[PDB]
């Protein structure tokens, strides 16, 4: 009576701040063609997150494999058509929306997401479908995702040591060196995230529960081995809230491939997405989204209960799955 953290610790109740899946963000439901699917509906940005296509030498950021191109020869990205669409530089983005005061105010990341969100037909704008955008911090280049899907894997599709050689389009969401400077945005990403969302790993500090006047400790934890700050983050990302479950499938593959060759905008837009038939798959942000790292004795501590305060601990690092792989802040 009362908590002198709370306001600061708001950006760590992810079930509110983000309200979606993290490893797999498929929170909204939207009609694409006759069919209805599930689309990334996350209020927070996922720093360092990206898509790896297994048995490929092609980036997920490369434009889509439309026409004669073999599916796995391409990436997820929206086609190059007008370099003032995708990918677009922050310079051009500032130039593009020059005559809007309300938005010229926005940061690079939020503007990027706002740009991806702009692609609707006035009359249909009521439709809560938009293309997800990904922002590269080192390039300062915003890319549009033609594919809203995140994990084609499991049974029919991706079984270990494939008979389909490399031909099969197998993908999973990962956090690593390649993606270190990347950031996965939804249509829903809040314009005020540098206030509502977790960005950097809290250096020389640790997550705890505020109990009866004293910043107490975590009641339940899962102790796992972590060699680095990155390893911890990576672990708690796999552990975090995820909408599409572990090894999920329902659509055909050659029919999905046909759509790509036959350059169908809706087939591509909808490719490898779960239905809006169903809602129980939505994590809504609930999950094992938070971790603590004992760097002095390499251990990761994950939990499925939101933190409500921090401990002055110098040998520790407090992190969330949305939080940046490298970025850190020892402030307290």
């Amino acid at each position, epitope marked *: 009576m009362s908590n002198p953290w709370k306001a600061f610790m708001e950006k760590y109740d992810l079930e509110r701040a983000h309200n979606s899946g993290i490893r797999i963000d498929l929170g909204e439901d939207a009609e694409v*063609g006759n069919s209805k699917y599930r689309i990334p509906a996350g209020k927070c940005p996922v720093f360092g997150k990206g898509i790896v296509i297994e048995n490929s030498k092609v980036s997920f950021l490369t434009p889509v494999a439309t026409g004669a191109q073999r599916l796995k020869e391409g990436g997820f990205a929206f086609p190059n058509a007008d370099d003032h669409i995708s990918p677009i530089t922050i310079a051009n983005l500032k130039e593009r929306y020059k005559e809007n005061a309300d938005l010229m105010k926005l940061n690079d990341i939020a503007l990027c997401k706002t740009h991806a969100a*702009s*692609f609707v037909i*006035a009359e249909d*704008q009521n*439709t809560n479908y938009r*293309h997800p955008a990904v922002y590269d911090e080192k390039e300062k280049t915003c890319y*549009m995702l033609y594919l809203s899907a995140q994990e084609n894997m499991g049974p029919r599709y991706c079984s270990p040591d494939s008979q389909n050689k490399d031909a099969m389009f197998c993908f999973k969401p990962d956090k690593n060196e390649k993606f270190d400077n990347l950031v996965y945005l939804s249509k829903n990403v809040r314009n005020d995230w540098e206030n509502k969302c977790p960005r950097k790993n809290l250096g020389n500090a640790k997550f705890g529960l505020w109990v009866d006047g004293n910043c107490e400790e975590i009641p339940y934890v899962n102790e796992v081995e972590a060699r680095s700050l990155r390893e911890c983050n990576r672990i708690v990302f796999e552990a975090s809230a995820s909408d599409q479950p572990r090894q999920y499938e329902e659509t055909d593959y050659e029919k999905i491939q046909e759509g790509f060759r*036959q350059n169908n905008r*809706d087939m591509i837009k909808s490719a490898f997405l779960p239905v809006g038939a169903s809602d129980n798959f939505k994590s809504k942000g609930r999950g094992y989204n938070w971790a603590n790292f004992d760097s002095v004795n390499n251990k990761c501590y994950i939990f499925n209960t939101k933190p409500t305060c921090l401990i002055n601990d110098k040998n520790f690092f407090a992190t969330t799955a949305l939080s940046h792989p490298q970025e850190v802040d020892n402030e307290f």
Partner: antibody
Amino acid sequence: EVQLVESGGGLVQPGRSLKLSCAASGFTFSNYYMAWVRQAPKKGLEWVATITTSGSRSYYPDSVKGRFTISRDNSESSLYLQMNSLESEDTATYYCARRGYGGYSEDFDYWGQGVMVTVSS
Amino acid sequence: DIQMTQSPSSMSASLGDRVTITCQASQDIGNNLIWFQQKPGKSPRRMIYYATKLANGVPSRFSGSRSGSDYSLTIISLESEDMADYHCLQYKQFPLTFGSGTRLEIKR
């Protein structure tokens, strides 16, 4: 390389009905939204209706709401505008124009030749 | 209910001269504006899309300009194939509304 050939139209008395077809050719129809636009003699254009690639949703302004209906058959590449309980102020030339697709600059790039539709007693 | 106010009613211009039609909307359109050339008895043709982006085939003498509520189209080195009506359109908000039109008559 892209065709929009309207058909139908002509004269009809008020309260009566009329269907305007528009065969599309040269483009992958099912990849584009479609629309109808009308033009009264010595007057500006008037957006009439919109239809999604699938046909899922239809958009009409208060001007010809629930008295007009837009439709399409992507399997046999063609568009329609069923005009019911017609008015003398509905007397204009009708244009099937290829509506856009979000993230593309297709918006009203191509139109049909036009079709004279006359309503009077 | 997005009032498009295309002005003037019509205008006279000599050859090589410049002409500026100024379409202005009541509420906010982004850069969702289209200039259309309509020639006597023929289907209109797209000139300028996304308020400033000159569409395929449309000559360099054509160009669009935004400044708040106001939008304009300019034909700079006037030809005998500029004798047409010019129309604006907002495709930002439902319902899609057009301006009155502007009759381009060429001085001889």
